[model samples]
Target chain A: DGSFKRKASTFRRFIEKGGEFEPEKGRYHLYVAYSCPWATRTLIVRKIKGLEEIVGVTIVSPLFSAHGWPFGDVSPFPGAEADPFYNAQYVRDLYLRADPKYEGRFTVPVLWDKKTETVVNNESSEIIRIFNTAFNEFLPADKAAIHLYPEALKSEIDEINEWVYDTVNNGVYKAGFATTQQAYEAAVIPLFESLDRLEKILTGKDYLVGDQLTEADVRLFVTIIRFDPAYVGHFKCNLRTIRDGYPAIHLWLRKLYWNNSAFSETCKFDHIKASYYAQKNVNPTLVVPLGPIPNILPLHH
Target chain B: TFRRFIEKGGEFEPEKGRYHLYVAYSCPWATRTLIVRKIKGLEEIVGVTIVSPLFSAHGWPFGDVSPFPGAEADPFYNAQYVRDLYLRADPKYEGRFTVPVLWDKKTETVVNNESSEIIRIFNTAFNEFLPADKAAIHLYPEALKSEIDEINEWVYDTVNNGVYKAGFATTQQAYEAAVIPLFESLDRLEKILTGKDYLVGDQLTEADVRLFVTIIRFDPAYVGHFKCNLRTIRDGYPAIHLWLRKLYWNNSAFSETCKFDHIKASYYAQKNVNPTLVVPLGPIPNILPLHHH
Candidate 1:
């Protein structure tokens, strides 16, 4: 995916519908990978928003080898994942669907426009915001009024998001996927540091920022969910998990997941755990880890 | 000819009732076309023939008799081995003549052997024959033509064909390279579908059709046999997994044609993928119900 470079959204960019980028039924589709934490963001929104009918979707296989995500007609798309719209064999095709010479890494949470036949935006942050607002014009208020990012705590939320994205959000990946030792150290320290910070933050408030869910919480959820599933064993982010040390963070996650649809339905332990542990590099035999049987640790639910 | 098929004024002109499809219920590619026939509403105009998916070393056997529970053989040809029919038409035929063939009965010749070609043919070529009430959604609309084409090519190479490269590859290098793209692309897809429904811009299109066939078979076949061990489509790619469940439960076009027995048997019996030819059983209950977030 060497081909991505643009003014992407972060918190991202919030835009209102006018001429282009309008939300309409049968106008946009999502392309996703089950294993990816970032890509899961849009998936949660799709479910929370209940856009299964209005919008369509496709899923890429979770094996992250040298070539990355792939699609094959031989494997039933919906049987394994789902790509109802065109049932493409690969996720990259959606990128190519947007631009043939779209020479960049094909990242997920793709906000595609079937009407315009271009990627509305490839960045997850922007695509989720689009979902948060665009559909209201044509859809019902409930459908449009999903407030993952409310305006009341924008300032505080922004501050929380900044550290999380750099330290915790992407920090684990830097630790796991980093090629150099220095890079690993640089990422691991801030990663745990931020986790510790959030643990403290959550000790007071029930949520990340404000009482209700926001973009900040969504951003944090993506990484936090994968902590033990794949990150601990495969990514080597094994210092400690949210369940062990950060009791408060663990409580917050369980609260959102157990009570909210966004946190629960979209979470796939199979994809999260398998993508990392089942990988040849991490587990050469490619044996999927069988532990943490119900994925989430037992809480006082 | 290839360019003409998917490009402007493609040679396979849109027609009705001229093309008849031949598919095996078990073959993943064939099943994909079956869904296409339904979604595109070509059932009325373009006739369809379902061949039994059970085949031996002789290659793509026909005939309705299958000792194996769900092996659906072709009843039309009567004779076994689909290649036999191909040879009768052209006695000198060679190579792996696969199923999901698009045949022109009137012309007494195969319009195309390739599944992509056959599905594309089914998409618009037989439009005139469709019923008036069927949905008139053009999978590859003129406006999104270029976009669809571009996606088709990459996906065919990276995802569609990528699995084969991984499954069939003898060299470790080949497997390594092929699988990375497979997963890298998966990673990309995870990001793309963060909040929407379809792969192409906003609506359903041929792009999804192109990806569906592969997605459906991951856990059923590829995960164990193809050595696509990096991840199971259901466990690793949840959004895609949920998307798949929604479509399968909702669309008869997708479910009716999907024969798990054939898909499972084909790979487990391939000999190469599974050295012992023993199919694993743990990935039970093929379709995991979708839990809405």
Candidate 2:
């Protein structure tokens, strides 16, 4: 089975209040690829927790070679800046700095510690969770009140997050990256079926699980935001576009994109379109589509 | 373009069962002739021979009978290729042997090769032979020619052949250059079609027929295959979507000439672009019934 299985993130250190890398102001730096959903999760959480001043970010270029994600003043777009810390060419340079013998891929959402000059965490989900409540000590009272992971709804959020992660989130990659048609069908069918099920869940609630925007919504948002643009044609998760087929999902997606500028601002369509279409392995044409024309539609309640 | 042998007191007067239409189901230009033939009830009056969809080095081969849908073999001369007819018509013919060729059985020459001219010829060439209904139906009525030409001029540029120019582009820059205008034109058409029943004069005119051939292929051929995936007709343009479905579901002439199998098969056969040659299964149920319509 030539199906795609995402590589597990290597770095796993956290920023607990009294840990080796203590939770503090302006200590942790984030490195991200705006096109990547994995990296985008951390960006969303940072925005939600009002950590813009607390955690600085360096957005690497979307296009990658065998050399891996590179940071430079010469960005694909005007918004992205160079790697300010080390001025390293490749992200692997930072990975090597963290661990000399690091054998895995140089992936993003890397939470680096400026004081220790080592990786605090590279896993997006764990990074989001760490930012969720770890730095509540420094934030404003109103900012501290915003809890994405509440004790009362932890189990429900986890259960919902698990399914969404398996089907809608990484499931698209499985379908798109699958070498065999059988492997592709195996991933695609369940992905849409899960969307159908998730649609029913969201039709009654504004958010994913019994409340305000949570970690679950952020996770689902990263993937759904990329759905119509990158996934539909490039990844071939095109049973139906989220815009055309699923009404509830479309409404939810539109609300997140238009209602809140944070989600929209963090998302980069140009990066998403270029990263996928310019990928010579998948799309040999390298001809990026000009479409699904209006990327974000009017928000509907 | 060649001068057409049409109108009253012309050299080649329209007659019943004296002309043969050469077409390819994969072609929109050829498809235009096929639809007009059906709508005008000229199926019996005019004969047809469908060329193969796959164009080789020789181009548009003619066989005993076509295996593809809405196609047939060369009946009159039993020629092995369409170029044979073109060569027979002129002997020194140095032009492209294109489709929707109106070959006269009497004079044994091509009356017209242009689809726009051929469709107009079919609209009235044999009007006297038909019953009052089919004869009275005029797609390019003189009163609406100005309106039809005004719309057709822009549409043919940005939509009809616009898709071809976009998909066949050599570079990404060229592809993008063509694609933006293509969609922009579609956007303009979407706006123009608002509150109006058709592109020209409230009735289905040459403009609707011209645009339909391209719109029918938009999702099934252009969107994914041609890198025209900005938006689908089902989702992008409400007015154009409704107009298309009304023409398709309500009218047999429009629907009958459409062959999704041929369109999809022909496009996927381009191994240079699609190495897997896997025809996508989706944007499923090709044409959906508009709930309100």
Name the top lDDT candidate: 2
lDDT of 1 by residue, A22-112 (tens): 5567877777777687788888887777777776776776655465566534343232464555565566666777668877776776777
lDDT of 2 at B274: 59
Clashing pairs in 2: A291-B230, A292-B230
For candidate 1, give the DockQ. 0.01
lDDT of 2 by residue, A148-213 (tens): 888989999999989899998999998888766678778888998998998898885678887588
TM-score of 1: 0.48
* Alpha-carbon local distance difference test for all models: 0.67, 0.84
- Which candidate number would show the highest DockQ if scored against the true structure? 2
- Per-residue C-alpha lDDT of model 2 across residues B33-147, encoded as one tens digit per residue: 9999988999999888778776556767764433555556777777777888888888898899888798889988988999998999888879888989999999999999898
